[PDB]
Design a protein around this nucleic acid. Structure first.
Lengths: 216, 121, 111
RNA sequence: GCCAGCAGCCGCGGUAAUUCCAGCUCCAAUAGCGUAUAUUAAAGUUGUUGCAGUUAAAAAGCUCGUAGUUGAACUUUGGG
RNA sequence: UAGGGGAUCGAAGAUGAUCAGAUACCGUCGUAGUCUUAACCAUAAACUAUGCCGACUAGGGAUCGGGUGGUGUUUUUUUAAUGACCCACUCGGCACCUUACGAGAAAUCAAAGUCUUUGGGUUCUGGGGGGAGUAUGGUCGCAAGGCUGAAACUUAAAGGAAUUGACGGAAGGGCACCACCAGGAGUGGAGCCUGCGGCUUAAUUUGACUCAACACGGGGAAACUCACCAGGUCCAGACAC
RNA sequence: GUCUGCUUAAUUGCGAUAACGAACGAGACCUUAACCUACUAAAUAGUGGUGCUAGCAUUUGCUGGUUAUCCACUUCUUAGAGGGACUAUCGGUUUCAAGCCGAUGGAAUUUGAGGCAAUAACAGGUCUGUGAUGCCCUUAGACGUUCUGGGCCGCACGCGCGCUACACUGACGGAGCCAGCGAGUCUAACCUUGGCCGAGAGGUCUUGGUAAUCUUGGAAACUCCGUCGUGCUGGGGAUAGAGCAUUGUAAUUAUUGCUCUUCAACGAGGAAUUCCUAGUAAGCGCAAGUCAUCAGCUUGCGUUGAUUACGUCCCUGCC
């Protein structure tokens, strides 16, 4: 075995829910992780940085090995988390999950010249953590993935393909860097352009649409 | 000391839930019984479970003791629950007392007040 | 030495074992010594119960460099056993009584 | 046997030196290798593109000012 | 700098204390100065160690100053009037909490946010550590001094935040008569046992020195034991040439 | 996770908890001391009954002796199996959790006590236990081996661990007169009685014993009955002179002992400073460990056996 928990778990095992875009519409939580295993399988992992700490005991120095993990596919779906642990083999691992509850859309789209098949972002975004400032900017076609090794990485998994970048921003902080960049793409969706204004009209929540299956 | 332990309490506190009824305080009649029920290590351990229990049924009777209820104490709370009869009906002082500034909104809101009220500190 | 020192643990754990921790004292690629510890499952270090449950070993290694020690400590499933005890001294286990039905009136047979 | 000596820097050497002297053995360039000097890239450690200025080295003690430098919007769009 | 003022404190100076020294800490007196007029100097951890203009992001609940509205709270005086008050709202403060979508090396930050998706306006500053904010010149001041500001030489780190393996003669909790009460028998005194300091000596063999050295190497040795000597021997010198 | 709190001999446990459940330690376990009028057996343990019998009574009685006169026993005494206690039972006391008092039954402060004793170590000690052992040195005028003699036992003194005593609550003496841990001879001299010889220390004939079978059931503090009378004694037993013994090739820097006399301090122990909560503190012994001997030490036991708490963090010390 999987097994389940909560009203939200049970549903997706059964399969009364299908896509991840249900879940960001009503904007649910997520506690269990299998919740996006069944759905998105495309998903692939990647390990960025394995560093030792340290919390320094009475005749010694303790250590763990922050990893930090990024996950996703191509299509507008990033995942990110940071679980210290001791020994690697919790530390990555129950990083990989840490990221998976944090899957987050993106909102690939056009530079200009509408054309056919999204390559770049919709708009300018920024992010901030402690020090770093990221100014993602939409670039025309295969221009390129203009940035550090790591950012490239994030941004591949999240296709996305092409976009100018810039930092500030101490980016010997692989960890506070990604923290930030992430908090910007996750924020394309958190920016009214004319093409949304056409008022959409609220569906109905899963939490009492399949209310009975959702319980014993 | 004489100071009790988890393994013990939490073994009597699990027990006391089901078996309040066989249930007693002559503790020498629990001792026997407390084997037919638990699947205990030891003889010493066992004589310290029931010791505690008898420290429950000797205070239970005396009254409502805490964070433990066993389908018998919880049905004397749907039996003790409820009460005052008649419900609130004033005749005796009829007119129901209505600050005397309690006439404006409800002259701007209903139907029948049988009210009590402070002609002006 | 890190890698095997998971066929040790995992080969043991697969074999319906309760727990196994594994000391590796000596010198490593250092000059100043160490030890290293590992593990899986819950493990006791005090009474009988060691006498009876877990067990040791020390297997002297005669590297080049300098000499080691290895130390394994299995733990045994109280159930899988027969050796004396079937639990710890701790474990107190409980029945979920019976499901009875009430009174009627009186009622009797003739045999 | 902390003496010779090596080592651009970290560092070896104080009686079994993976560094010194030397034998064998292997590695790299190879009619060409090393060595020192100067410059370049490396140097987003001079920077307009691209830096840093809460404590790392740095926001003047604070304000006024002649230069310097920037400076709201509005003056024919649309259609044929 | 020159007049006035000169209570109190109080460098300097004197003292008595403490102390191996004490020219310091502790105590008592004490010019000068603290105060003021008039004139200088221009430095400070002059500290939010955070340039100002702006414009935009995310919640709160306080407060000072205004202003607006509520047949709003009392004032009672007859109703008002104001006024204090309550609440609603706002603009401008002086801060604070909470998040972190952001930023950061981090600690933390509604600004240190909108920065590799790198660019709203512009003034100062720094580019390893010292040498040294010195030497020099140039300049402001009466002087103290300021602002300006080298190089030779030397050097592989100096530093920032954070970590528990540890450390403190900092606080807060436990545990034990190898720690005290409640007390008993004492050791330290001697008549004598031994054992470790040491001087002695043919030699006075030898390990062991805060709890972890002191009738302890099971050390209770007349030979021996046996390691100190003062001396006698015999080799119990294989293997090959 | 391994924690504010309450909890314990205890990271020992309830409970509080983005922490869930385990390993080692501790505890469980092993040693011994207690208990079993139930079992299983005993001329290497003891009962009555039985005579044989030796005394006092004579009243049938009372006191014996008997490794067999027989048997019968198995409380006793041994010791195998075994069992048996858990703080039990109410009563309180508390988060009526873990726990803690008290009184009954009970043989019975973790039943008492030891022993095993993780995690990491310390440059603590040790090549003077080694035919465990690195590398230096020694190799016959050896630092290797061995026959002798002395030496580690030498004292104006400094520092610890200890024995007897400052008394009449004791020293001397008759007369009562009591255990437990052991050990032990074999290829040779370990324990020795008994019955003599010696004031004695001993000598010995001879005896048993490879031992619940022998010496071995008789140890001292004490009750007895008193002399000593507040006299540094009749507390103190220092240091001495000889002899006589008993071991040891060697008795000298008398190994010990006896026989009688020399009659040293100290008249309750300063600045210090230990060890201790129950058969516990401490004193009276003895058997072993040395060993040919020489204990004022090491270990182990019992026989008499109480005060004083049964709590704290003032201290130290460490968590």
């Amino acid at each position: 075995g999987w097994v389940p928990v909560t009203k939200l778990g049970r549903l997706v095992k059964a399969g009364k829910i299908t896509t991840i875009e249900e879940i960001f519409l009503h904007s649910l939580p997520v506690k269990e992780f299998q919740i996006i295993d069944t759905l998105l399988p495309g998903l692939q992992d990647e390990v960025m940085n394995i560093k030792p700490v340290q919390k320094q005991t009475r005749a010694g120095q303790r250590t763990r090995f922050k990893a930090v993990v990024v996950v996703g596919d191509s299509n507008g779906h990033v995942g990110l988390g940071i679980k210290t642990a001791k020994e690697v083999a919790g530390a990555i691992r129950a990083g990989i999950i840490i990221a998976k509850l944090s899957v987050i859309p993106i909102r690939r789209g056009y530079w200009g010249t509408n054309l056919g098949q999204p390559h770049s972002l919709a708009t300018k975004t920024t992010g901030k953590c402690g020090s770093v400032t990221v100014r993602l900017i939409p670039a025309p076609r295969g221009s390129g993935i203009v940035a550090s090794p790591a950012v490239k990485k994030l941004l591949q998994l999240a296709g996305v393909e092409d976009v100018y970048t810039q930092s500030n921003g101490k980016t010997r902080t692989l960890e506070n860097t990604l923290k930030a960049a992430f908090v910007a793409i996750g924020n394309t969706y958190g920016f009214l352009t004319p093409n949304l204004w056409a008022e959409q009209p609220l569906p109905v929540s899963p939490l009492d649409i399949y209310s009975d299956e959702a319980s014993a | 000391g004489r100071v009790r332990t988890k393994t013990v309490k939490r073994a009597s506190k699990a027990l006391i839930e089901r078996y309040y009824p066989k249930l007693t305080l002559d503790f020498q009649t629990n001792k026997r019984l407390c084997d037919e029920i638990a699947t205990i290590q030891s003889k010493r351990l066992r004589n310290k479970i029931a010791g505690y229990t008898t420290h429950l049924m000797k205070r239970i009777q005396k009254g409502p003791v805490r964070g433990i209820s066993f389908k018998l104490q919880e049905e004397e709370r749907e039996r003790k629950d409820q009460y005052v009869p008649e419900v609130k009906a004033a005749r005796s002082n009829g007119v129901l007392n209505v600050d005397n500034q309690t006439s404006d909104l409800v002259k701007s809101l209903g139907l029948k007040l049988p009210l009590s009220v402070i002609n002006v500190s | 030495i890190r890698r095997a020192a998971y066929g040790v643990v995992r080969y043991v754990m697969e074999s319906g074992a309760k727990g196994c921790e594994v000391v590796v004292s000596g010198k490593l690629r250092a000059a100043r010594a160490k030890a290293m510890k590992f593990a899986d499952g819950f493990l006791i270090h005090s009474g009988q119960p060691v006498n009876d449950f877990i067990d040791t070993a020390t297997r002297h290694v005669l590297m080049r460099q300098g000499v080691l020690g290895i130390k394994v400590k299995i733990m045994r499933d109280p159930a899988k056993s027969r050796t004396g005890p079937k639990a710890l001294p701790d474990a107190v286990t409980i029945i979920e009584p019976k499901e009875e039905e009430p009174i009627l009136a009186p009622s009797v047979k003739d045999y």
